[PDB]
Design a protein around this ligand. Structure first.
Ligand SMILES: [Mn+2]
Ligand SMILES: [Mn+2]
Ligand SMILES: [Mn+2]
Ligand SMILES: [Mn+2]
Ligand SMILES: [Mn+2]
Lengths: 191, 190
């Protein structure tokens, strides 16, 4: 609920802040040699059985949003994230809420080279959080299959830690991956 | 949709055969140093956006042999040493609401390190980023809120009947009693 500015969200007192990031990379691959993958988007299965974007809570009195994100990404995704600088330019949006708890979440979006994502996936099994906070990394299917369900629509029927779905739908729009009509279709096909 | 025998299946006309496996290993690890993992159970995100177990379609070789082939393709080269024998066979179902289909479910215990190596090398499998969008571990615990963990996990999208197969494994491996399973299901669909 509510799109707040970064600058205004940061000026608030007694709010709990969170940072999450969509890491992505272009791909020339085709599923079954016919269906283009287009782009690789990382999400993860969380300890709580829900899908989410990597990241977490940041205490903005101690460290910066970016520094907090950085530290959270390393724990969740592993060493490979020491070559990766998610900076202010990667920042995208911020939502604020007061119930259940005064919470602001920030959303980042960073493009990488395909092999970087691959190095990340290869090394995520060595992350401090593997098999604990993080139950596994997954790629988001951007395609719809011949049955009009399989792929993205079906994927959106999984269980998402509150708000991550909306962030994802935001990112599909912002990266020009899907038209508004296409997103609407994907949501109907899902239901 | 319907329970069946291995011999009533393998001697059926028409129908296409499928094999999937739960690979699992014990674990002493603790979430937030508090909540026991108990056991590591592999599943995966499929290309179709659904969760399922690794495996697939088998007049060919044999149920064990096909499963091995699919597991190698989907999990990587590490699998070639995993036994996956008749001793690891468990059950068979018959559906007909999407062409005559027989699913054969397998459960095999490995060593934790074996599961770990499987995860690490899965990214080099033929099917990584194609048929296989990533491996996951099944959370077996339930968090303070009485939803997070297994109950919330059961609200994800499962490819036909894999959920049923999972719930069986929880009973079969004595991880949860019947009432416990019904509790997580009640919490899940609530
Ligand atoms: Mn975290
Ligand atoms: Mn997190
Ligand atoms: Mn396969
Ligand atoms: Mn398969
Ligand atoms: Mn196959």
């Amino acid at each position: 609920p509510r799109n707040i500015s970064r600058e205004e969200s940061l000026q608030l007192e007694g709010y709990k802040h969170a940072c999450h990031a969509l890491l992505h990379a272009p791909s020339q691959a085709k599923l079954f040699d016919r269906v283009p993958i287009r782009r690789v988007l990382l999400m993860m299965m969380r300890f709580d059985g829900r899908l989410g974007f990597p990241g977490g809570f940041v205490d903005t009195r101690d460290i910066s949003l970016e520094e907090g994100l950085k530290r959270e990404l390393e724990e969740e995704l592993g060493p490979a994230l020491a070559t990766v600088e998610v900076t202010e330019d990667d920042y995208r949006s911020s939502q604020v809420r007061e119930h259940p708890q005064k919470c602001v979440t920030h959303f980042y979006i960073k493009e990488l080279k395909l092999e970087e994502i691959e190095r990340i996936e290869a090394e995520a099994v060595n992350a401090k959080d593997h098999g604990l906070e993080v139950m596994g990394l997954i790629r988001v299917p951007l395609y719809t299959l011949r049955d009009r369900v399989g792929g993205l629509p079906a994927f959106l029927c999984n269980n998402f830690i509150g708000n991550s779905k909306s962030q994802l739908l935001y990112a599909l729009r912002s990266l020009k991956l899907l038209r508004e009509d296409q997103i609407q279709e994907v949501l109907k096909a899902s239901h």
